[model samples]
Target: GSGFLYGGRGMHGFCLNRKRRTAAGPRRLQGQDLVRLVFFEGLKPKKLPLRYFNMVPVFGRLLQRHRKCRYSSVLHRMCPVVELSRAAQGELSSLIPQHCAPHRVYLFVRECLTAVVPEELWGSDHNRLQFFSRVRGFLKSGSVAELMWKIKVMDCDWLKLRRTAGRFPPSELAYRTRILSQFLTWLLDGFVVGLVRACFYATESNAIRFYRQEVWSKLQDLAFRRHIAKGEMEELSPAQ
Candidate 1:
């Protein structure tokens, strides 16, 4: 490994550069998900070596505790960077788990994507319900809600597979995730694109006004707590 100077809180002005290793994927606005994945890899037990110059006396629960904290930190570290919804405030912490394992990644993706997006369908609690009087309440909720609904619909296919052919645990991660990857690809192919294209059909005035006045303020606070956020939003509030 290479040694380098580091200071997170200090403002280096225009000097935020460092030689760091970063990989890509899980794209979309779900970038924070990718961020955590990167951090998780950085903290992998193989590299950490449990202290003591990569050799330890196998300390008691302290080591275990330290190790555990890293996992949870990786999972929850970005909460401050993304949270603006206090409607279900304390609830999200309960949704995220403390360990990183195979099937657990399944649960992790859902919570990560779910938590990043706003839940309102209008006004305050996502119940605004009316984007345009000329049409039905199709994109009725926040992009977050629309995505939430989309993910829900996609799951029925997984359930169908499990119900029809029970070769493995009905809750198997492979099958469940296989379906999600497919759905995600479909979204990329044209589904979400059409939805967004449809959005510009409405005048940008009311849309931009609401977006800036509402979303921007919320996003501003989240980023201020850590750190420009908007485009990453549509994909982020969706699946990471």
Candidate 2:
């Protein structure tokens, strides 16, 4: 039978029955498979806690349509910061879940990193891809502790690089901070209708309608304004 081996450690190198957790194998990553694990931690009969909301499935769903676009790597060629691609735009599009907001955000975040970070930090295409891959792993599997640690590390690295380069403005840093912070906050705050249905009950009837009219409408206006601003900036300098 497959079982734990009991080894005792002591003065004579013998210790017994010290309870320890063990992994059976590498973690799973597949269709709705990851969701199963996430929901186990996320879905409860009460308030949808911030921690639960930030899990892949919940967080992804909330941010997917909000960020809602495909962006090319700036390292490849000069292009718009974010280009909205049709849902059926490419073969890779088929791989991404339509309802999966977090996945979309992950892709967007990679583009943001590739766009903003100085070449000295991640100069080559290969380096940017490697960096994004590592970040994807953290986004997929890292707990809150891991997420915070990685974000802090990246922030510190960016600060050091910025100081060294002296080319990036404070506004650039502020913009990056605004986007990242707001994106995470949006994940926690979006998708409220379904998330709060359990507690709100009968009032939940009008929730979707309310959210669409009141919440989503405002977001759309803001997004549209941002889109226009980005377009104007591109007109000023197409290379940028």
Candidate 3:
């Protein structure tokens, strides 16, 4: 959304879809419900390519424990970033076949605009609740293209506001805020693999492990192991 980088240990960053794709309707947020959609309703498999969707679930399983953290965005290869959440954490790894397809993208929006923002603003007003309900529509079926369009509009809207004060309430900001949050969620989904790619392509061509620092360190050690004599290195601890 904002095109800023967010990184933190054990934090769930925002999710985003890549630009240039058609937007879908509101996606289901409940993990159990999604499983039913995939298993019984015959969704997911039709919507996404199995190859990419399959790999994404592997990433999803790893990020499950830290879904609430602010830095937990999941990056797609050539698509937008998707953030993670507890609901996705439960679904993606289960026996459900289609869970991986839209789970990451859906979860990112849920965690950001739906989960995080409401937590930030704790008021019991009908208007506030209604505004969020409208915002929820975007996330339920997040389209990268639609989100991108909204993001552009948000910029224009902000420019308009700068020229005129009190013309738009802070409440009106909710529209763009939700859009931007979902955009960031998409970015998190698609870009993170770049981190792994940068390291793996630069060194070992055979490495299949994702972006775990321990694995990266292991790869480095393995590559240089021949140069190091026995007992010169022991297993690396967290301290190292």
lDDT of each: 0.28, 0.33, 0.33
* Model 1 segments more than 4 A misplaced: 1-164, 170-174, 181-185, 195-202, 206-240
Clashing pairs in 2: 8-14, 8-15, 9-14, 9-15, 10-14, 60-101, 60-102, 64-101
Q: After superposing candidate 3, which stretches have Cα over 4 Å from the reference?
A: 1-105, 116-147, 150-157, 160-240
> Per-candidate TM vs. native?
0.19, 0.23, 0.20
- List model 1 lDDT by residue over 1-240, tens digit each: 111112112111111112123344221212222222222331133433221222122122222332233322333332223344666445453343222231232232233223322232111222212212101222222233234232332233322422354455646655554534443333222222232221111122222111112223234435643532354355458664
List pairs with backbone clashes in candidate 1: 29-232, 29-235, 29-236, 30-236, 120-126, 121-126, 122-126, 122-127, 122-128
Which residue ranges in model 2 land beyond 4 Å of their true spot?
1-98, 101-103, 123-126, 142-240
Clashes of each: 9, 8, 44
Residue-wise C-alpha lDDT for candidate 2, range 130-229, written one tens digit per residue = 5466555544431232242233223433223223545676776665444344333222222211122211111122111111121232344467567766
lDDT of 3 by residue, 1-240 (tens): 322122111111112211112134233133332222222342243543342233334233323322454332332332232444567554452322111223343334334433333221222233334433433443232234334332333342322323355557777576546534442343333333322222222222222112223233334546544434332333332453
